[PDB]
Design a protein around this ligand. Structure first.
Ligand SMILES: [Zn+2]
Length: 165
């Protein structure tokens, strides 16, 4: 029954806790998060973004939208090089900006079945991994921008929700 939190919500700054065991409940969070992500046409989503404060990320960067990746307790064990591309975020609707990142990452994680696995990534996946793990640390891509640009984005989003609740 998930919707995405939007900047400047303080719940987006919560540091996620490790998942302890991959239970059917965790599997259900995973499934729901993938449905949300596809419906919002995203290529990644962190649990923190739907107010679930546990280290779960889902990603699909494929143009055919059928190559899902599930990352439970992901950890970047090595970063190499520098790169960056234009990023957006379902939690920052309407904003896009170049973010400096590592070019390559080595990532360890559990899959949807609790199997630990390790992989290297570059290009869009490396970027999306970094972006999504930032969320689990309470960081948003607008944190890499200038204050004036970030403040404008914040003010525009606050306006949108000013009559809520
Ligand atoms: Zn994001």
């Amino acid at each position: 029954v998930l919707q995405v939190l939007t900047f400047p919500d303080d719940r987006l700054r919560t540091v996620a806790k490790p998942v302890e065991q991959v239970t059917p409940e965790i599997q259900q969070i995973v499934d729901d998060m993938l449905e949300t992500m596809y419906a919002e046409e995203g290529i990644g989503l962190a649990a923190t973004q739907v107010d679930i404060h546990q280290r779960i990320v889902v990603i699909d960067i494929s143009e055919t939208r059928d190559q899902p990746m599930v990352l439970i307790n992901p950890e970047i064990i090595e970063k190499r090089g520098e790169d960056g591309i234009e990023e957006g975020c379902l939690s920052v609707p309407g904003a896009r900006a170049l973010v400096p990142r590592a070019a390559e990452v080595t990532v360890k994680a559990l899959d949807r079945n609790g199997q630990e696995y390790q992989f290297d990534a570059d290009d869009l996946l490396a970027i999306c991994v970094q972006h999504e793990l930032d969320h689990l640390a309470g960081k948003l891509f607008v944190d890499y921008l200038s204050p004036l640009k970030r403040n404008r984005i914040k003010e525009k989003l606050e306006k949108i929700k000013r009559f809520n609740e």
